[PDB]
Design a protein around this ligand. Structure first.
Ligand code: FE2
Ligand code: FE2
Lengths: 513, 513
């Protein structure tokens, strides 16, 4: 179970690469399924230094857009840097011009980064690469050309937005960002972008605030990375990782310098009625953790099931993700993670109906969970999770599901990237009911978030494949490849090898063609 | 996994029986191991009503002492009521005379029960049956005669004592009970009874207070059921189940009426240096749970590993253990448990060395756990467990280990009784490192706490058997039997059937002969 990486091949995930001018034909081993037709689109950093000025953090390198195309069993690979302000101005001036998450730039107002290195998602007929700021970047998903920059503040009152909007079957987009909501107060706004309507105009110009969540601290919003969505409810988790706005507006500093941990609050969970557009005043509380990715959320009788990838503790996990740390040799990478928060997959169960006559008791009356929710006299509901996966410094992270058909609904399976002291080195499948797992790994191979693609005529939940981009440096070996696994048991079906390196990618999607 | 008991045979665990005048030869099926030589001694209630006056709670029925003897593959069974004050006076007066845990008796000073229905343990050359009060009862382990009543208050300043003293290899006994310790204050005392010394006098007359733990509340001690012991440390867990002494001394009421839950404190964990006899001022804190049984505790580098059978929530679990509830039909037993705390086996890891320079970080630097301990600025150490077993209303309870050789030391295996909505219906083995489990169960069979007995030539931790007393009522069937399982995989080795019923038993021991 404890796998070692003494060769240090994971360092290639963080080495600069060049863009291609046209797509590259990939060498196929095994058999690419013939129904797999479309484009795997993924974002990540590709330039980790501008000349002699280095980027310091994992989330600083300049956005590179990757694409693997699949048709009739053949595969191509293409990549282009996103022509953002951050990238363009850095190429023009031959230096780092915009301040990135953990890299301050040396020398009009505050120039917020639009380095869209995190994720890509559809709004209407368009696709937008994003990071976590107010700026998103329209891209062409066939050529990978950078179409335009969009400033979300032109359309709605929010200071940022997550790279994990939820998208319903009709194309309706929901997302969360903090704002200066009320009188002398901070809040978090849920924005809804409708699908493309008859009049064919930009759906973003029809953005609106659906509902607002209160903040635990008047002047300090929590860092929100993702959130939960069901047909009827929105779920938001407020962690003790706080953004100090006073400290940001003072400054030259970077984004990381403005984060702090609130030691006493623990985690507050909030639910809103999605259709009635109304915050529900249920004071759900639990112990402290970092949270980046919701796995999935759904309704079961009068309860919300909330599956989370947690990190136990209140220190901000991103402190362990500086490039210097991740480029260290293996023994030192392990040492660096010794005092880090511990990863754990957790199921929380939130009762929707709080009856006073149950004060002091466990309200989770469901038959198939060990999660609990205690109603206290002060009207807080204290929650304990059911643990679904727990491995020592072995994270099930970057979770993916059969989203289109089981997102926001009762489900059984999640796929994830396994992180070993923060270094990605395996792919995982988790049965969230039985807790059985499947694993894929090979020595000296470092994979990316697995994306699920259904067989188009699937009736079962895991009838399909997962795709992952893998780096595998070494003598007598192709430096990278696209991996295709059978979603049933994570056995290898095919892989598509390329002869150039591919750096780390965070998120992406499969666009059926 | 969800086993049903529509026939309601579990009710026989709570039906009055008669004592025997001499031992009964048991009918053997399979093969009793020839090295198994000695006496299985177990305590439990055997009289659930005095004439027409009923006892109400599981911990009220009058103490019955059971014994299965093993020699050269043959088995006898014997049982006698313990001639306590509670029992004797009830037979004399033809009514309930002493107030039991959940049964008040109708008409100075305060007459505290000596109903020794819980456990039996050795002190020097003697054996004592006990409950949780200041009165313990010397018994003869061969004849099952009741020798004498001992009032612990004659020897040491404590108001009670648990039924789970720890006993070292040399015979030294440690235990915990609360006391009016300091000025205007409550505390908990650790008492040590030495082994039988040269002068041959009663070791109890040489009892002494080793160390004292402070209380979270000035006038309200927590209910303490058991505690942890290693070669060098004592571990005590202070739960939010509190005893209200003011409410007790006011009263006619019973013991149960004086319990309450503190909603805000959570759980406080305390450690004392055993050899230097000194409380260590480390403020370990975690979320609320009920706790009855420590599984085992041990030292690993500079950390205490603390394995616990927990119930998630602060409502007192004993509220669900009234005889009326446990005698209900199956569907109503399940309904009654719907809002109960959820059982969970948990490993906590307590750092012994708290360095201020790690404030805000996880101090658990061990490689093979996901347990964490966060050092806060206010100097509390917040703890999160590693979950070892978690099943919906399915408790791994009444834990036992290879105590003599692995108690207080690094270990791998625990055995337990599986409770299904509080009804015992299976036997379990847990590998505390890998989390693999083994299960024994048969329809309509309701077993007792499994006791481990080692093979004389054992090379490994689980080389031996577990013994359990099982009730199995029904047509064409022996109403009860002693079950012998192989500790390796919990496969059946033998059983020793008797033709009379055997009610529920709580704890006991095997006395090698
Ligand atoms: Fe993310
Ligand atoms: Fe007990």
């Amino acid at each position: 179970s404890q796998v070692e990486h003494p060769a240090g091949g994971y360092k290639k995930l963080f080495e600069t690469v060049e863009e291609l001018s046209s797509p590259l034909t990939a060498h196929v081993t095994g058999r690419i399924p013939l129904w797999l037709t479309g484009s795997l689109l993924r974002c990540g950093p590709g330039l980790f230094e501008v000349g002699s000025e280095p980027f310091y953090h994992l989330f600083d390198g300049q956005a590179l857009l990757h694409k693997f195309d699949f048709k009739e069993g053949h595969v191509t690979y293409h990549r282009r840097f996103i022509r953002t302000d951050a990238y363009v101005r850095a190429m023009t001036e031959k230096r780092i011009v915009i301040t990135e998450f953990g890299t301050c730039a040396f020398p009009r107002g505050v120039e917020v980064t639009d380095n869209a290195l995190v994720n890509i998602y559809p709004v209407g007929e368009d696709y937008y690469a994003c990071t976590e700021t107010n700026f998103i970047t329209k891209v062409n998903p066939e050529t990978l050309e950078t179409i335009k920059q969009v400033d979300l503040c032109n359309y709605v009152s929010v200071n940022g937005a997550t790279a994990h909007p939820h998208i319903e079957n009709d194309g309706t987009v929901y997302n969360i960002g903090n704002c200066f909501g009320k009188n002398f107060s901070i809040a978090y706004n849920i924005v809804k972008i409708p699908p493309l309507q008859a009049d064919k105009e930009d759906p973003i110009s029809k953005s609106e605030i659906v509902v607002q969540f209160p903040c635990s601290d008047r002047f300090k919003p929590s860092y929100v990375h993702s959130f939960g969505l069901t047909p009827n409810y929105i779920v938001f988790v407020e962690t003790p990782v706080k953004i100090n706005l006073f400290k940001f507006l003072s400054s030259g500093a970077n984004y990381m310098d403005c984060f702090e941990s609130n030691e006493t609050m623990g985690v507050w969970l909030h639910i809103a009625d999605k259709k009635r557009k109304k915050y529900i005043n249920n004071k759900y509380r639990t112990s402290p953790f970092n949270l980046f990715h919701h796995i999935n959320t759904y309704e079961d009788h009068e309860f919300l099931i909330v599956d989370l990838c947690c990190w136990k503790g209140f220190e901000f996990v991103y402190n362990y993700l500086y490039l210097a740390n991740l480029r260290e040799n293996w023994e030192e990478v392990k040492k660096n993670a010794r005092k880090a928060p511990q990863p754990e997959v957790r199921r929380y169960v939130l009762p929707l109906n709080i009856d006073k006559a149950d004060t002091g008791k466990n309200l989770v009356t469901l038959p198939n969970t060990t999660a609990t929710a205690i109603l206290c006299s002060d009207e807080t509901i204290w929650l304990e999770p059911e643990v679904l996966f727990s491995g020592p410094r072995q994270a099930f992270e970057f979770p993916q599901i059969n989203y289109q058909k089981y997102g926001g609904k009762p489900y059984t399976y999640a796929y994830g990237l396994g992180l070993n002291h923060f270094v990605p080195d395996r792919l995982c499948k988790l049965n969230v009911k039985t807790k059985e797992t499947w694993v894929w790994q090979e020595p000296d191979s470092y994979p990316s978030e697995p994306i699920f693609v259904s067989h188009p005529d699937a009736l079962e939940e895991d009838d399909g494949v997962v795709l992952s981009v893998v780096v595998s440096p070494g003598a007598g070996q192709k430096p990278a490849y696209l991996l295709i696994l059978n979603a049933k048991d994570l056995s290898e079906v095919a892989r598509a090898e390329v002869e150039i390196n591919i750096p780390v990618t965070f998120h992406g999607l499969f666009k059926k063609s």
